[PDB]
Design a protein around this ligand. Structure first.
Ligand code: NA
Length: 325
C-alpha cells in the first residue's frame, strides 16, 4: 500500500469572484492510495484564507506516506492530522479505497441506504449588477441561486438579481463583506427581497453584532465555522452553518459535525470549494437530508473529471464508483 500526492489545475468557466477576490483557475490536490489492484482517491482545495498553500498541503499529504503504508486508519487519521485541505484528501482517499476493496459503497456505509439525487445551489459570481442580472436571468429556471455579494454598496446588485429570477429561492453570500454600519439595512433589504439565507455577512471574529439584532433572514456561518468543537459557541450569532469537507478535514469529521449541528438545532448547508466532481462526490453524502446543498463546483469549471457527476438542471446525481465511493 502506497500513497501519492498530485497537483492538478482546472480552468474556471470565465472567472469566479467573491468579495475577497477573483479566481480564474482551480488548483486542487489529490491523494491517491493504492493497495494491490485497488485504488482510492480524494481531492482537496488548499484555501489561502485559511492559511493553506498548495506546497504546504502537498507536503502535509506526502508526509502521511509511511503512516498510510503502515496501515493507517481513518480513525487514527483524525489524530495524526489537523482538519484542513490535506486531511480531506487523505480521508476521502481512504473512504474510496475501503469501498473498492470491500465492495460496499461508501454511500451505503454513510447513509445506511443508497444516496439519492438532490438540488444544488448554482453560484452567480460577484460582478457589476448588469452582468449579475444577465447571468441570473439565464438561470432563472433553477430552483436555488446563490448570489455573491459583500461590498459597501450591494443594493443595485441585490435588487437586479431578484428581479431577474422572481421565482428562484435565493441565498446571498457576503464572504465577510458587510459591516456593523450596513448589516441591518441589508437584512431588511434581503427580507423585502424574499432571500432565504445569508452566508457570513460579517468578518469572522468581528461578528458579535449578530447576537444583538433581529434576524429577518436566517444567517449562516461559513468562514466562522471551526470544527465540531466551536459549533456550540456559534449559536448566539448564527441560525445556520455551512459544512465543507476542506474545512472539516474530510468526510469522517463532516458527518460528526453534521450530527452535532443537528443536535444543536442549526439549519444545515453543505457547501464546497471550487473543485471537481471528485471533490463533490463525498459531499453529496453529507448533503443528504439537509436544508441546503451548494455543490456546484464542476458547473463553474470549463473542464471536469471524466467520468464526473451527472448534473441535470440543478439536480445532481450521486457518485458512481467509476468516480468515487
Ligand atoms: Na460561503
Amino acid at each position: 500500500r502506497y500513497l501519492q500526492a498530485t497537483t492538478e489545475r482546472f480552468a474556471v468557466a470565465g472567472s469566479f469572484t467573491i468579495s475577497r477576490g477573483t479566481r480564474t483557475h482551480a488548483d486542487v490536490v489529490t491523494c491517491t492510495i493504492r493497495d494491490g489492484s485497488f485504488t482510492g482517491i480524494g481531492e482537496c482545495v488548499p484555501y489561502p484564507r485559511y492559511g493553506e498553500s498548495i506546497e504546504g498541503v502537498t507536503a502535509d499529504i506526502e508526509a502521511m506516506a509511511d503512516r498510510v503504508a503502515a496501515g493507517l486508519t481513518r480513525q487514527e487519521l483524525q489524530q495524526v492530522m489537523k482538519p484542513g485541505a490535506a486531511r480531506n484528501a487523505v480521508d476521502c482517499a481512504l473512504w474510496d479505497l475501503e469501498a473498492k476493496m470491500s465492495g460496499k459503497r461508501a454511500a451505503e456505509q454513510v447513509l445506511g441506504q443508497p444516496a439519492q439525487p438532490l438540488v444544488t445551489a448554482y453560484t452567480i459570481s460577484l460582478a457589476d449588477p448588469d452582468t449579475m442580472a444577465a447571468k441570473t436571468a439565464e438561470n432563472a429556471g433553477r430552483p436555488l441561486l446563490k448570489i455573491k455579494t459583500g461590498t459597501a454598496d450591494d443594493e443595485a446588485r441585490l435588487r437586479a438579481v431578484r428581479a431577474a429570477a422572481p421565482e428562484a429561492r435565493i441565498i446571498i453570500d457576503a464572504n465577510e463583506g458587510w459591516n456593523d454600519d450596513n448589516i441591518e439595512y441589508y437584512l431588511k433589504l434581503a427580507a423585502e427581497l424574499k432571500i432565504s439565507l445569508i452566508e457570513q455577512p460579517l468578518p469572522a471574529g468581528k461578528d458579535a453584532m449578530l447576537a444583538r439584532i433581529e434576524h429577518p433572514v436566517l444567517i449562516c456561518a461559513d468562514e466562522s465555522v471551526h470544527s465540531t468543537e466551536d459549533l456550540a459557541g456559534l449559536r448566539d450569532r448564527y441560525d445556520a452553518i455551512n459544512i465543507k469537507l476542506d474545512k472539516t478535514g474530510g468526510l469522517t469529521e463532516a458527518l460528526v459535525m453534521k450530527a452535532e449541528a443537528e443536535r444543536l438545532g442549526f439549519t444545515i448547508m453543505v457547501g464546497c470549494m471550487l473543485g471537481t466532481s471528485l471533490g463533490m462526490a463525498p459531499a453529496v453524502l453529507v448533503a443528504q437530508g439537509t436544508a441546503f446543498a451548494d455543490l456546484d463546483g464542476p458547473l463553474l469549471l470549463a473542464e471536469d473529471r471524466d467520468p464526473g457527476l451527472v448534473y441535470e438542471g440543478s439536480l445532481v446525481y450521486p457518485a458512481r464508483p467509476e468516480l468515487w465511493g
